[PDB]
Every structure is written in structure tokens, then in C-alpha cells.
Design a protein around this ligand. Structure first.
Ligand SMILES: [Ca+2]
Length: 223
């Protein structure tokens, strides 16, 4: 997160870190046994880390649970990042409490102008590289479809939306991928892609979760 703020420990209780020996992506807890993340974050050997603030220090509210299965969206295209969504099942159910909690799925899509909370442990610099140890947060609005498509000609599908600031300086970044965009208590987006980070006229591009609720629910029901 570039241009954000320190969230505060366990203030974002659905935020997870995906770990394969090291943090590599975020995710969102959607029930006691399932996480949603970005398909471009796929790899084998994932451990899900819940209840984290400092990802380098054990602070006392963590739960570390191995994934048993990952399911990339059946239409994911890694060239275009269309359908950049994946589900991860935990080997055992997490213990839900005030610091480890699920986030609701949308019953309706959000609109341009809605303010949302984006979070992660990704890079905090718009040029060069600095990785935080504690969770960072950014409040940002959803941008119009027309401004999103104008920013990224030929690249925005119906499964993507843009959020952030066209002036630059505030955005998600590398290492935030797969993490949440929450608006009015609903998971509306997944951190997906963008040109660099926090660049002028290059806002963040997010997977549009409301298009996937049927697939998520059916998949969970049968796995
Ligand atoms: Ca920790």
C-alpha cells in the first residue's frame, strides 16, 4: 500500500497473509474454512496466516493453517488477468473471534463513488521498494467505468473495476495482490493489477467480486 496508514493490530480481522516460507499475497477469510484471493497468486504449498499484524513477529493472535486445496477460477486468463480470483480451503477450520473474522460477500455490486478500505503488506513506495512488517490500510473510492477504461484502453473487462486516485500517490502495490477491497462491510474487490503503483492516471484494478458470488457459493457447497 502506497500512501496509506497503519491499520492497527487486528482491526481488519478478515485480512490473511498467504505464506510459502515468506509472505507473497493477501487474501480474505469468507468463512471458517475458506479464503478468497487472486488467481495470479496461485502456488502449491500455501500456509494461510490469520490474525496477523506484524508478519515477522509472533504477537499472540495468529492462527497458521495449511491449505488443503486451491481452486483457480475456471476462466482465469493469466495474460489478461480476466477472472483473477481463486478459492483456498483450509485443512482445519479457523477459530473465529473478534480479531479473526469472516467478511460478507456482496448481495449487490457496488457503484462508482463508493468509498472502500484496501489493505495489505505490499510495497509502500511508488518507485523503489520498502516492505512493511505491519498491515497498511487505504481508503479509496471506486472510479467510473468510463474513467477506468480511459486509463487502461483495451484492458478493462466486465470483471474488473478501478479504485483509487487519478492524481497518483495512493494505491495498492506488489505484495497486496489477492487482498481485500471492502465497501460498507462487503467484499467487493480483490487486489489484481495496475501499471506500476500510485502513478498518475494509472489507478488500481480490482477483480469484481459481485460477479463471482454464485461460483463461490456453489464451489464451497461441493468441496
Ligand atoms: Ca505476527
Amino acid at each position: 500500500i502506497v500512501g496509506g496508514y497503519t491499520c492497527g493490530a487486528n482491526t481488519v480481522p478478515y485480512q490473511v497473509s498467504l505464506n510459502s516460507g515468506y509472505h507473497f499475497c493477501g487474501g480474505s477469510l469468507i468463512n471458517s474454512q475458506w479464503v478468497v484471493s487472486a488467481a495470479h497468486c496461485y502456488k502449491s504449498g500455501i500456509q494461510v496466516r490469520l490474525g496477523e499484524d506484524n508478519i515477522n513477529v509472533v504477537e499472540g493472535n495468529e492462527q497458521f493453517i495449511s491449505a488443503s486445496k486451491s481452486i483457480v477460477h475456471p476462466s482465469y486468463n493469466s495474460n489478461t488477468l480476466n477472472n483473477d480470483i481463486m478459492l483456498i480451503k483450509l485443512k482445519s477450520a479457523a477459530s473465529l473471534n473478534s480479531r479473526v473474522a469472516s467478511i460478507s460477500l456482496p448481495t449487490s455490486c457496488a457503484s462508482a463513488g463508493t468509498q472502500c478500505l484496501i489493505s495489505g503488506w505490499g510495497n509502500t513506495k511508488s518507485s523503489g521498494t520498502s516492505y512493511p512488517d505491519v498491515l497498511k490500510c487505504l481508503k479509496a473510492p471506486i472510479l467510473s467505468d468510463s474513467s477506468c477504461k480511459s486509463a487502461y484502453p483495451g484492458q478493462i473487462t466486465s470483471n474488473m473495476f478501478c479504485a483509487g486516485y487519478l492524481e497518483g500517490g495512493k494505491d495498492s502495490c506488489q505484495g497486496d495482490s489477492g487482498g481485500p477491497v471492502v465497501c460498507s462491510g462487503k467484499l467487493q474487490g480483490i487486489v489484481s493489477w495496475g501499471s506500476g503503483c500510485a502513478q498518475k492516471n494509472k489507478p488500481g484494478v480490482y477483480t469484481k467480486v459481485c460477479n463471482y458470488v454464485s461460483w463461490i457459493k456453489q464451489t464451497i457447497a461441493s468441496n
